[PDB]
Design a protein around this nucleic acid. Structure first.
Lengths: 94, 79, 137, 58
RNA sequence: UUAUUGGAGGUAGAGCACUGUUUGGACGAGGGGCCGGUUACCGAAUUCAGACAAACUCCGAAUGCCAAUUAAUUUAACUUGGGAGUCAGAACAUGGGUGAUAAGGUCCGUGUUCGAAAGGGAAACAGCCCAGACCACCAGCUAAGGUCCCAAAAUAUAUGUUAAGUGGAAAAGGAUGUGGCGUUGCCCAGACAACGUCGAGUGACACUGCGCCGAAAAUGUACCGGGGCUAAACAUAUUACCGAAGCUGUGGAUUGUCCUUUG
RNA sequence: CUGGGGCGGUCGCCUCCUAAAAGGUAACGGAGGCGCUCAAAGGUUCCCUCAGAAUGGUUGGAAAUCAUUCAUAGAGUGUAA
RNA sequence: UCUGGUGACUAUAGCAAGGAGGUCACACCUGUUCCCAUGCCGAACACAGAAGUUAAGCUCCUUAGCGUCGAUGGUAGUCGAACUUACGUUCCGCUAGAGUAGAACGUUGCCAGGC
């Protein structure tokens, strides 16, 4: 399991988030052990791919900038209409 | 022939705050009208028979918390 | 049919219909359910009508949950009298559904039978619907 | 430094609170203009009524 | 009026900690099947999960309100006296009650316009959109709205969609109408149908753009204003023009404020 | 007064919701009260702390009374909210 | 530095659990003769003393078990603007409630005694 990420720069307005979601991209955040909070973005279909393979409770090799961080998916918001994930939280696991 | 049994109300009482936080007041100025004590009297502030809060000296008004979930008003002298 | 045993007030203001569904947006008791996609009142005669239609097609095989209850009474005047001499008498009980609210849930049958029974039930309701399954992922 | 403000849209049809701001800015008739020094206060007044005026760095 | 700072207060939204309403499942105490008890069934309590509220609240905004500053712009405010008129309001937008989530209905809150407002647009059309007419002019720039002819200005430049005159009046439902976007099946070792040949694609699902049916009224075509249109329709972008009593240019009138040459 | 008038209902005061987080705000809109009472149920100085739930126990109407623990006003506060 | 008295602070201070301490304090503790007192009970209150005890209250160390506090990111709602009549859409500011990471088994003033 290996997901790659991109760092979101400061202060996305709501139109930016809307365009971002109109792609296959998902806003997310990473926080926890040995790390400071970083706002990132992730592709939706690849995330579904790796989650269908590692399971709901599994470890991911998320790549953030130059680092790579073992991480676990803490929570996620989901739109019941439109059937699409809309936000994910990532938790560094030490 | 139908009618209603509801038709009545009482006149409104003009309760609530009467002076502002940070404003200068004179001796017996009314600061707050209420039923019961939603706000308690603090320093240099009295409480009337109808629970009215009023100043006892000249000074400036200060609303401020009392405990975890209570409030009070005070008046401080120099101004 | 379904109506509360008692209420504090018999004459209430009518609910707000704009917005999106506040809660109950997921299947939690069974495995299939009927999701609403438009907004309306459901009148407690439609609920019984749709439940009878849905429960007889399954031949008393599975279980059914009704995630909706009519809590609000609405009034209506006698036959077309002049306007305004007091509020009218109670006539029915309604529940307000907004897009995203699950309405029924079934379990204990095949996916095919569930699809058919929920389709049968959805034709008795004044709202557009959609067959959904228990979420995962 | 300095700004130049021009009233490009008319004020009739608008709420009165916006008319008071347009008058406080010093603008009077349509297409009339002023020059003012840039402040946070002036910028707040421009922000309130920006669908009516145009600004140039002067 | 704005920036900064301080404060009072329980709406929207959320939530179930209280007061009420409600759906499943447990747990046990009781009556209770029996022959006192099994089990059923019945009611109460505690629990687990999940819902509802104008007269519920452990929470709680955006705004609006009250103030204070040697803050920045601006031009009012108050007091005393003389003279009034008004006390039938209307539509539109938005927060609500009533009514039937009827009315060009009726009653309140908040804005605007009419009333008392000409001019341009909306075919015509007090209340909708743009705009506030001191008087000349056969000068110029723009707003809303527009550029085939009626009738001023693009038969304009790129890309695409529609075949219904949709555009130019409506729903639940129904359907091999056609674009866009993904996920996943069966692929030349031979499917996908026809009856060994057939020699390459063949499905489902999901999601969306535009269209079709559902669609019946009385004097005469008869909601595009008319002609007429396959773009002169509708998404996107570009940039050129037309367009008002708005702004500007030139001359003039009246009054005021400043300086003062009383110009 | 009045969604024409009549018939019916209503007319002063208090509390709540409508009321759009200051105050104010209508309808023959939705719900209730008042036309008193108290010689202590007033003043002051000292003390004190509940309902309820749970487990026991003669009478036990299940609960009257007694004992322990938990128990935020759920008690109580002359009279509506 | 320890203990005590007395203040200030939204429980980050509380409740629960485990473990240790005493003649320097404090408390349990002895008794009811006297001051005083109990709808009865020296239980409580009050007074008189120091025999015992750290058992308890209390003080110190451990734990995040319940309670309390609590971001970032996202979402709801909404001032303003622009389209529109759709149980609406678009842009720009502000920005919850719930939930997650996490904090937390108190901080501090004055006086006396002991150090």
């Amino acid at each position: 399991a290996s997901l790659k990420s991109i760092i979101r720069q400061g202060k996305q307005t709501r139109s930016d988030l809307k365009q971002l979601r109109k792609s296959g991209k998902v806003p997310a955040v990473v926080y926890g052990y040995g790390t400071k909070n970083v706002s990132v973005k992730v592709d939706e279909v690849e995330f579904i791919k790796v989650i269908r393979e590692v399971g709901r409770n599994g470890v991911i090799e998320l790549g953030v900038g130059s680092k790579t961080i073992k991480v676990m998916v803490a929570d996620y918001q989901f739109d019941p209409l439109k059937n699409q994930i809309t936000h994910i939280d990532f938790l560094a696991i030490n | 022939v139908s009618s209603t049994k509801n038709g009545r109300d009482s006149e409104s009482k003009r309760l609530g705050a009467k002076r502002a936080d940070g404003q200068f007041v004179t001796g017996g100025s009314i600061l707050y009208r209420q039923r019961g004590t939603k706000i308690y009297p603090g320093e240099n502030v009295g409480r009337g028979g109808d629970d009215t809060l009023f100043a006892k000296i000249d000074g400036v008004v200060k609303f401020e918390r009392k405990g975890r979930d209570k409030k009070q008003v005070s008046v401080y002298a120099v101004a | 049919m379904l109506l509360p045993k008692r209420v504090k007030y018999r004459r209430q203001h009518r609910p707000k219909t704009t917005g999106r569904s506040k809660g109950g947006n997921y299947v939690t008791f069974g495995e299939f359910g009927l999701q609403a996609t438009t907004t309306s009142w459901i009148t407690s005669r439609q609920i019984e009508s749709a439940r009878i239609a849905m429960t007889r097609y399954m031949k008393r095989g599975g279980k059914v949950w009704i995630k909706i209850f009519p809590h609000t009474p609405y009034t209506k005047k006698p036959l077309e009298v002049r306007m305004g001499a007091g509020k009218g008498a109670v006539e029915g009980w309604i529940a307000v559904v907004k897009p995203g609210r699950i309405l029924f849930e079934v379990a204990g049958v095949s996916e095919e039978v569930a699809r058919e029974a929920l389709r049968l039930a959805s034709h008795k309701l004044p709202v557009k619907t959609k067959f959904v399954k228990r979420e995962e992922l | 430094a300095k700004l130049q403000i021009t009233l490009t849209r008319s004020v009739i049809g608008r709420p009165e609170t916006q008319r008071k701001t347009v008058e406080a800015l010093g603008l009077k008739k349509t297409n009339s203009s002023v020059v003012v020094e840039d402040n946070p206060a002036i910028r707040g007044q421009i922000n309130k009524v920006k669908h009516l005026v145009t600004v140039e760095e002067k």
